[PDB]
Amino acid sequence: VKWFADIVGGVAAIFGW
Amino acid sequence: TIRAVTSKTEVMDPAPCEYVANLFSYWRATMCYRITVVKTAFHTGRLEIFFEPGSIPTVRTADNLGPDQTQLNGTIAPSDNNYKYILDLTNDTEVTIKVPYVSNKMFMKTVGIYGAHDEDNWNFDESFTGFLCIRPITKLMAPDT
Amino acid sequence: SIIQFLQRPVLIDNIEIVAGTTADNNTALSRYVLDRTNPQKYIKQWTLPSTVLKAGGKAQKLANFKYLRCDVQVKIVLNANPFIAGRLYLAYSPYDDKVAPERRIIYTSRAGVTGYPGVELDFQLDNSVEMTIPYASFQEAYDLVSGNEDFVQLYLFTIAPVLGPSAESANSKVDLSVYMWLDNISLVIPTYRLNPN
Amino acid sequence: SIIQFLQRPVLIDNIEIVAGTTADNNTALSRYVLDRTNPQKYIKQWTLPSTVLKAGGKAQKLANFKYLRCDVQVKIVLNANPFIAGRLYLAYSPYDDKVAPERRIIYTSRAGVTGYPGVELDFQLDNSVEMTIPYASFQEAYDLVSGNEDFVQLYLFTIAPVLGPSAESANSKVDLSVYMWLDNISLVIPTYRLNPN
Amino acid sequence: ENTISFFDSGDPERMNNEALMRGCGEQIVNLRPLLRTFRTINDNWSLAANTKTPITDLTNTADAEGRDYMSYLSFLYRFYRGGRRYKFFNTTPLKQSQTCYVRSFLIPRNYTADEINTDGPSHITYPVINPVHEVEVPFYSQYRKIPIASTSDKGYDSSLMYYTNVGTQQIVARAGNDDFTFGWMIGTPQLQGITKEV
Amino acid sequence: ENTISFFDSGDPERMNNEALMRGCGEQIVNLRPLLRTFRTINDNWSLAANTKTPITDLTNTADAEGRDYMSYLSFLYRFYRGGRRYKFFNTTPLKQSQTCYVRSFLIPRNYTADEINTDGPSHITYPVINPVHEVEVPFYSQYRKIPIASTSDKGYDSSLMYYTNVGTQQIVARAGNDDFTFGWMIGTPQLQGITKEV
């Protein structure tokens, strides 16, 4: 569920950081 | 299409929705097709848009690929047992069809027509859940005026 | 999921009628009917419900079933150009094909005909219409393996012939489209005997 | 009402096997399998799910549909005389017809075979049995217009050949009956392309 | 259904859970962890230079002998849902001054390395500095699972496209990814062992 | 503006967010992260010795084929606001006793390496010890943004001035800096693929 925990918190990684 | 001198290189005409998938391998997505008729308030006619899942009756050309028109008549593959939309052209013209994604396999490749020709049409038949096909319910009604 | 394929329309015939003609697509309901040699000229008699089932691939569904009670639906779509103006009348008379002619919708006047249950239809205002033809049988329910006792005839008839420009140069034509489905459905009894038709 | 015709059994084959024979109905699971010239002799390979649909008149139902996800059921009825005693084993191996032979239920020992999921069957105690063969595909759901990628082979195999009197005068035979239906059903997508087979 | 028992033995999960602290440092209860342990399949796999060679062209005469677990156990089952970490060691006589830069790529299974644009994710290791190559090819198929070995796999999964620049001999090992298991359970194959010419 | 929908499909962000844990270890929702992933453009780029060679002289026949993402995606947009990490691997036959000390510098874009005092920040790595070079040229221009490729760039940004001492062959890769994105959105180019002489 890890990446599915970040995609839901909209963390600053997915957007390219 | 094919650009020549022979050499016969291939050339495309993609959209963003297509410009991305050429950058990846598999895909899954719902689509949205804006259908706009350009006409007056006179050009009238009931137009049918219907979906058919899976492969297509097509013509496997030696270098390119395209469809087959004979297998689509109102008798062979009609649109009663097929998702349907009958757009009228009196005054309601703009449409935006929204197709979800359904298929036996979860994702789908993204070669489409790349390296497609008579023999190697395989991934193409696997890289498209199905197809829409327009077919008039009525001959375009518009005076010679 | 079991029937709703029935409750899913189907296209029967795509029709066209042109100006100037003097054929079955015209001669709107002769005021009088003296002779059975010159009856009221129809457009497309549908001997419901059969013609419905034998199309739209619904028969394959009705297979392995015997009895049926269903009121049919209709949807007429029409697309003509504003430069045309005319009026038609659709009507349904049960057992019209199994009864003495003195009573049939045919061999009968315009007044009586348009008095038959149905609806008018204009090419400009009522572009598209519908109808609910109920369960007109007189028995427990309709059979399917027989498929011979069609208990209705759906008669189409015109009121005013097509009207267009004086030149009437082949662009003063119209076009129709009929769709049909069934409601108030009941599938009851199984069997192995299948109507091959 | 829409599917339950599927969830309504159907008879596939009525089988008979007699004492004394030395044919495909015997030679119960040779302890060893050295050669593919002398594999384990089966009884009736059913390449499910297809063989189910193409019978019981269910295909006419599955028409105008594309995708399917269904776990099949089974019911074996058996009626032999007390004077007989024998044992069989039914087993199912997915993709057994689309995989290298070194792994197939065929070209494989008795131990491994009977290790395949299934069930034993006696002619006196477990007169009649059933089974639930689940959705063994590896894709979103099974297609129907293709009807070529049957994702399972239902292998029948024997353990002890038929056993009866020493005279074995033609009355020391048994008889079978297979029935099949489907569960966990899902009809999803329409179409006009129909598997003609 | 009468089922009896002999020896009135005490709690079996009292002696073994005791009789591994006397005999076995490790206490194995699962079976999946085998697929996390690399034990080799080949020991030479003499390769060729500047020829991107896929791996399926090797691991086809690998899942037919059981020389590892990822194959021996395959027969027991039919499906799999994970990636196959492939570790590659070198043994080539690289007493030379050339620079080996063995390179790996990603290719769909059962593609022949000639119909491919060789781009995307990759890896490069130097045996002269690090005689290993320890990629972790994930599971990028589009299906819930996959038959272990069929003939209809025209891109239903990912593979390696091992590339090199020199004529090399490699050791190999393969276990499986942290999410690599098998599907159904089935029976067993037949085994051959020692042979005695005469 | 009538817009309809088929198939009455359940929440699409219920199947995919589920149907990646079955098929895809990674769950991609942005697009910018591509520019943080180095995938190569060249594979030989045979260089020359003791000749500080800029990089623009290479990455001009690089943003014309899309062999990477930092170019393929360029067309979609027009601007950029970040630095381009350039990683350089070696493949040269350095079976020799010489000491390679490949050196990098900083030069403004579209300067020709002859009109420069080559001082300031730098870097030196040895391929014999470390066959890479992984600089992170930042964005030291003076403008909010920059057109992707115009002809008026007489110092509106920074570049590399890759220096070496030997005749070498290199592998290359370029993604972008942690703050490297693109500007506006525009349409798409035309693509050519396979060609069949005859």
What b/e sequence results for D95-114 when a residue is b if at least 16 CB atoms lie within 10 Å of its CB, and e otherwise?
bbebbeeebbbbbbbbebbb
Per the CB < 8 A criterion, the answer to whether B100 and F9 are in contact is: yes
Question: In C11-109, which residue ranges form alpha helices assigned H by DSSP?
Answer: 50-53, 59-62
- As beta bridge partners, residue F40 has F173
Whether chains C and B touch (3+ CB pairs under 8 A) is answered by yes
Q: Is D192 on the interface with C (CB under 8 A)?
A: yes
Nearest CA in chain D to C188: D1
Among candidate residues D82, D140, C86, the one with its CA nearest the CA of residue F16: D140
Among candidate residues E45, E25, E23, E26, the one with its CA nearest the CA of residue E34: E26
For chain D, the 3-state helix, strand and coil shares in percent, each to the nearest 5, are 10, 30, 65
Could you tell me where the beta strands, DSSP code E, fall in E91-146? 103-104, 107-108, 123-124, 134-135
Of F24, F39, F89, the CB nearest to E101: F89
**Cis ω before D49 (30° cut-off from 0):** yes
Which residues make Cβ contacts (< 8 Å) with residue C144, sequence separation at least 6? C53, C62, C65, C66, C67, C68, C195
Count Cβ atoms below 10 Å from residue E8 Cβ, excluding itself. 5
Quote the CA–CA distance of E176 and E33 in Å, as a whole number. Answer: 9
Residues B82, B85, B86, B91: what is their CA dihedral angle, to the nearest 10 degrees?
A: -170
Among candidate residues B68, B105, C57, C59, the one with its CA nearest the CA of residue D193: C57
Q: 């005859």: which residue's tokens?
A: F198
Which tokens go with B141? Answer: 């009604």
Give backbone dihedrals phi and psi of B16, rounded to 5 degrees, phi first: -50, -50
Per the CB < 8 A criterion, the answer to whether C137 and C50 are in contact is: no
**DSSP states of D44-105 as a string?**
--B-TTHHHHTTTT-HHHHTT--EE--EEEEEEEE---TT---EEEEEEETTTTSB-GGGSS
| Angle of CA points E96, E100, E101, to nearest 5° | 170
Quote the CA–CA distance of B40 and B141 in Å, as a whole number. Answer: 11
Residues of D in contact with C66 (CB under 8 A): none
Residues composing chain F: 198
Quote the CA–CA distance of E115 and C4 in Å, as a whole number. Answer: 48
Of B42, B81, B88, the CB nearest to C82: B42
Per the CB < 8 A criterion, the answer to whether C59 and C181 are in contact is: no
Among candidate residues D116, F36, B26, F93, the one with its CA nearest the CA of residue E94: F93
* Burial zone of D116 (CB within 10 Å; 0-12 exposed, 13-18 middle, 19+ buried): buried
The subunits that touch chain A, with at least 3 C-beta pairs less than 8 Å apart, are F
* Burial zone of C127 (CB within 10 Å; 0-12 exposed, 13-18 middle, 19+ buried): middle
Quote the CA–CA distance of C174 and C80 in Å, as a whole number. Answer: 5
Q: Which amino acid is at E33?
A: P
Mutate to test the interface with F, among E124, E140, E144, E164 (most CBs of F within 10 A): E124
Quote the CA–CA distance of F76 and F34 in Å, as a whole number. Answer: 14
Residues D18, D24, D25, D31: what is their CA dihedral angle, to the nearest 10 degrees?
A: 130
> Taking CB atoms and an 8 Å limit, are E97 and F92 in contact across chains?
no
- For B61, B117, E191, F148, F192, the CA distances from B1, given in Å and listed in that order, are 12, 11, 56, 29, 9
The H or E element spanning position C183 is strand C173-183
Quote the CA–CA distance of D135 and D132 in Å, as a whole number. Answer: 10
**Cis ω before C49 (30° cut-off from 0):** yes
Residues of C in contact with D1 (CB under 8 A): 1-3, 187
Of B74, B80, B137, the CB nearest to C56: B80
Among candidate residues D166, D191, D197, the one with its CA nearest the CA of residue D54: D197
Query: Using CA of residue F76, residue F78, residue F83, residue F88, what is the dihedral sign?
Result: positive
Quote the CA–CA distance of B56 and C102 in Å, as a whole number. Answer: 54
Quote the CA–CA distance of C21 and B2 in Å, as a whole number. Answer: 50
Among candidate residues B4, B134, B130, the one with its CA nearest the CA of residue B64: B4
Nearest CA in chain B to D188: B102
Per the CB < 8 A criterion, the answer to whether C73 and C135 are in contact is: no
Per the CB < 8 A criterion, the answer to whether D157 and D91 are in contact is: yes
Assign B121 to helix, strand or coil.
coil
> Taking CB atoms and an 8 Å limit, are E119 and F67 in contact across chains?
yes
Per the CB < 8 A criterion, the answer to whether F190 and B13 are in contact is: yes
Q: Which amino acid is at D25?
A: N
The residue ranges of every structural domain in chain F are 1-198
Quote the CA–CA distance of E150 and E162 in Å, as a whole number. Answer: 22
Q: What is the 3-state secondary structure (H, E, C) of chain F?
A: CECCECCCCCCHHHHCCCCCCCCCCCCCCCCHHHHHCCEECCCCCCCCCCCCECCCCCCCCCCCCCCCHHHHCCCCCCEECCCCCEEEEECCCCCCCCCCCCEECCEECCCCCCCCCCCCCCEECCCCCCCCCEECCCCCCCCCCCECCCCCCCCCCEECCEECCCCCCEEEEECCCCCCCECCCCCCCCCEEEECCC
Nearest CA in chain F to E129: F129
Per the CB < 8 A criterion, the answer to whether B133 and C173 are in contact is: no
Quote the CA–CA distance of D94 and D104 in Å, as a whole number. Answer: 9
Per the CB < 8 A criterion, the answer to whether E99 and F94 are in contact is: yes
| CB-facing half-sphere around the CA of F153: CA atoms within 13 A | 18
- As beta bridge partners, residue C131 has C74
Q: Which amino acid is at C190?
A: P
